[PDB]
Write an enzyme that holds these catalytic residues in place. Sequence first.
Site, PDB file in Angstrom:
ATOM      1  N   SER A 214      -2.616  -6.225  -3.420  1.00 57.43           N
ATOM      2  CA  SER A 214      -2.826  -6.098  -4.892  1.00 57.43           C
ATOM      3  C   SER A 214      -4.018  -6.955  -5.410  1.00 57.43           C
ATOM      4  CB  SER A 214      -1.528  -6.464  -5.628  1.00 57.43           C
ATOM      5  OG  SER A 214      -1.591  -6.175  -7.015  1.00 57.43           O
ATOM      6  N   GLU A 347       1.824   4.925  -4.406  1.00 52.85           N
ATOM      7  CA  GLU A 347       1.421   3.724  -5.151  1.00 52.85           C
ATOM      8  C   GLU A 347       1.854   3.702  -6.617  1.00 52.85           C
ATOM      9  OE1 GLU A 347      -0.081   0.985  -4.213  1.00 52.85           O
ATOM     10  OE2 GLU A 347      -1.043   1.373  -2.283  1.00 52.85           O
ATOM     11  N   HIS A 467       3.845   0.834  -4.570  1.00 53.92           N
ATOM     12  CA  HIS A 467       3.052  -0.384  -4.452  1.00 53.92           C
ATOM     13  C   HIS A 467       3.993  -1.600  -4.321  1.00 53.92           C
ATOM     14  CE1 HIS A 467       0.486  -3.673  -6.293  1.00 53.92           C
ATOM     15  NE2 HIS A 467      -0.314  -3.217  -5.345  1.00 53.92           N
TER      16      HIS A 467
END
Length: 566
Positions: A214, A347, A467
Amino acid sequence: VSLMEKLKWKIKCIENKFLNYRLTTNETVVAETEYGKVKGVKRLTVYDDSYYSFEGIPYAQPPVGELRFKAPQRPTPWDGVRDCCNHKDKSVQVDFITGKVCGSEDCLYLSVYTNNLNPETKRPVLVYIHGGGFIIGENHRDMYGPDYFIKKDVVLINIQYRLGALGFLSLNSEDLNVPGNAGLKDQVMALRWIKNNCANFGGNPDNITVFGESAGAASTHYMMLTEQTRGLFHRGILMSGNAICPWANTQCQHRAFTLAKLAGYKGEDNDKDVLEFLMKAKPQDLIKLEEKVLTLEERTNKVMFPFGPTVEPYQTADCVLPKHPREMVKTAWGNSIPTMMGNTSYEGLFFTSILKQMPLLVKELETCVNFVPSELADAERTAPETLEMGAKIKKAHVTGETPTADNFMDLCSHFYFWFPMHRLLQLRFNHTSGTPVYLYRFDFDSEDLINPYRIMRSGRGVKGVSHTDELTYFFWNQLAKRMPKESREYKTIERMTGIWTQFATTGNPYSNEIEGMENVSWDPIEKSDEVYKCLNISDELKMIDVPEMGKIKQWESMFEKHRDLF
């Protein structure tokens, strides 16, 4: 976050404290560092393995008082033994469960873990940079436990760095020496400490892998871009992110004033008087107010965070981002080290939570102009050219007459992750020695083992691989439990830590000592490749063509009449 998840968390916090006590031993050890001796302790894992643990090692001066907002300084050496048997506090931030500010300005520490202090050969050094949008996160073991990695023979290091406005305030006035990116400059100094000290923990200073997820991925990438760290480490893993993702930088020089005003500042917009106010304000007050800094215009144009990485307005000695990230790829030492990149299979499924509070966001897909890259779209997003790019986005992700929530989260996968990955690869190809880059796609879905981010994105009882779903298989966390050795979860832990450690050691991610990689022939990407090939990680490990390629190319076509902006 709901009251029930609050109390549930409180109880797991209490459990984790007692577990941490129980898992501690009396076997303490002393290591040399260039700053002085440090006392670590051995701990247990729930898999009956053990590891040496050095937590709370300072790599910078405490950045308080006059050092606030400023580039970090090297810490003061001591002569005696520094107690590193306990974790230090996290960077000041809003807690995502409670909603209260926590942490301290004294946060510039790092942790060093290893199953063997006296190895017969020097080991691969793995360095994890946490994500959290540059505004939350920590290296505490209740979130980033080294328990899985210590099964392998590596040295694992988890750093902290300043978050939010304290990490990323930026002022134009050259006289005040707040150019910005202090938090990134924290990362650089940690790297230099790791370079010069990892041998005392059995680490090979000529074999260091930095990796992050990230904001941690964009950080890792930034550490591969800057001249400040040239030659410091030798491999990189970009997990769901890089420095050219739209959220990964912003020009925030005007937002200081806004923040001061929110916090009680009386006076005019000049940097000096703003800085003096901000220097004296309570850290907790500054962090609590960061949410309110962004205007409606900015949020509309998808600016995600008020303060973060930025192009510094004037060059200083410790300067990290002197040009826009896209411009830095063209001159980056990191382009010539082995790199691995990858994304999860869904994601944008992360954004479910945010969608439930803002149902209106799904109507944005009617024209999709708010998702056109900023550098291409006009101010009001009303120009005919903008509606035309908007249309190309809409054909790519809207499946029916009317846009759905899944279309939206699908779009987000590409807007925030796949498309920036595509742009970086192509750009990198133009400016590189030709070191390999490998692609993976993490596609493994389980709800039997989770991590705290599932609490945040409201991911309870939701299928698909979002994610941060992959962090579960790399680090221990206080929501984890011991898994049977025959379980698909346990096997993925082995596979994931195995591949990462294999890539850390050799600069090549393939090993046939990993279960399921028998028929795997994992090639690097060539510039000649029209279609990206990646290892798809699910219950089975299978090389495929990137399934998001068609949409990726659709996004690319927005730059048809603007190829120099690509």
